[PDB]
Design a protein around this ligand. Structure first.
Ligand SMILES: *[C@@H]1O[C@H](CO)[C@@H](O[C@@H]2O[C@H](CO)[C@@H](O[C@@H]3O[C@H](CO[C@H]4O[C@H](CO)[C@@H](O)[C@H](O[C@H]5O[C@H](CO)[C@@H](O)[C@H](O)[C@@H]5O)[C@@H]4O)[C@@H](O)[C@H](O[C@H]4O[C@H](CO)[C@@H](O)[C@H](O)[C@@H]4O)[C@@H]3O)[C@H](O)[C@H]2NC(C)=O)[C@H](O)[C@H]1NC(C)=O
Lengths: 162, 120, 56
């Protein structure tokens, strides 16, 4: 299910040990993984949870409880997505492609809550008290989707094309 | 059961044969092409596997012909590139069970198409 | 209420992820769960704009 055999190759060699030289034959397979499973199960849910974050900028800025609940829920769900996957595969000490993707999505959803902190501080504590509060949301409703789409495009254009 | 129908026959160069399959093809993961003419035994040409894409070719057509597939259309294609006069034969599309024996032997194939004559 | 249902729908997917082999193609159950998800997801987009239009 996970792999399609791109090719197989046959080899013959002599291998040398301290006790002599021995004949070797080698049979090799090039296995390339099928990405559809991960699209359906991991990547798409991560994108959807990331989109769920952007609902924050449409909720009015004085409904603090809802803004906070949605943002913190998104961050928590992203953390759980991060931690669940690594139990299914070896605890190898480096960042994988999917790890970089999920950490980027975490950065986006985290800044999508630091954004609420910024707007709330500007609104309730520091044009600033009336207009700038709406201005930040007005920027974000396009800036965050744009930046996330750019990041997604660059991610695929690195890993698939090069 | 599985039903096969083929197209692309007739007198020829370059050509493409096609095979359309319907029914329970999941029981028959591998599709093979065979050819025969008067006074000679049926020849193995090449094979394709549903959902795997792997192919193998008889040395008589290796590097000349290629076989491909469309899993959504349930069609199998054989690209008759660079035909030669000796290629004259009726070409049969056939299905192989999952646990049948080797590729190269027609007796291992259960369901057979009507076959297309080609002339060169 | 909306986001909580969204989490629950994903919670079903994370279990169905486990019980079956990691096949590539979409299964009949997957076509249903993602059908339910879009209903649950749109139910939150419904309020997202009711809130916007009302307070705008
Ligand atoms: C998976 O990964 C493994 C490991 O990376 C891959 O295995 C390697 O496959 C390649 C083929 O793709 C093998 O190379 C062939 O090996 C043999 C044997 O060569 C040995 O024996 C010779 C006879 O004694 C000896 O002369 C050789 O040493 C000379 O040549 C090498 C060339 O690399 C050179 O570096 C040395 O300095 C010497 O000059 C060597 O000990 C051989 O028959 C093959 O030669 C063909 O290709 C060469 C290309 O230059 C050509 O000159 C020849 O005419 C001939 O066509 C070829 O070198 C390699 O040995 C395998 N390595 C191991 C460690 O097993 C495997 O392919 C991967 N699989 C997949 C599916 O990706």
């Amino acid at each position: 299910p996970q792999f399609s055999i791109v090719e197989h190759r046959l080899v013959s060699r002599n291998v040398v040990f301290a006790t002599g030289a021995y004949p070797r034959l080698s049979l090799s397979f090039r296995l390339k993984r099928n990405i559809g499973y991960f699209i359906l199960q991991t990547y798409m849910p991560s994108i959807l949870i990331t989109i769920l974050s952007w609902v924050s900028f449409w909720i009015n800025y004085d409904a603090s409880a809802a803004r906070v609940a949605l943002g913190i829920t998104t961050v928590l769900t992203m953390t759980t997505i991060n931690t669940h996957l690594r139990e299914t595969l070896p605890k190898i000490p480096y960042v994988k492609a999917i790890d970089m993707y999920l950490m980027g999505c975490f950065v986006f959803v985290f800044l999508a809550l630091l954004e609420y902190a910024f707007v709330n501080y500007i609104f309730f504590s520091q044009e600033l008290y009336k207009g700038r509060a709406a201005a930040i949301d007005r920027w974000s409703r396009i800036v965050f989707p744009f930046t996330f789409s750019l990041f997604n495009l660059v991610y695929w254009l690195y890993y698939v094309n090069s | 059961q599985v039903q096969l129908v083929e197209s692309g026959g007739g007198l020829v160069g370059s050509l493409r044969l096609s095979c359309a399959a319907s029914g329970h093809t999941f029981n028959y993961p591998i599709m093979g092409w065979f050819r025969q003419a008067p006074g000679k035994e049926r020849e193995f040409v090449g094979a394709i596997s549903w959902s795997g894409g792997s192919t193998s070719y008889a040395d008589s057509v290796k590097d000349r012909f290629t076989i491909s597939r469309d899993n959504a259309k349930n069609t199998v294609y054989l690209e008759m590139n660079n035909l030669k006069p000796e290629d004259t034969a009726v070409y049969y599309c056939a299905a192989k069970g999952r646990y049948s024996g080797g590729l190269y032997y027609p007796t291992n194939y259960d369901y057979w198409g009507q076959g297309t004559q080609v002339t060169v």
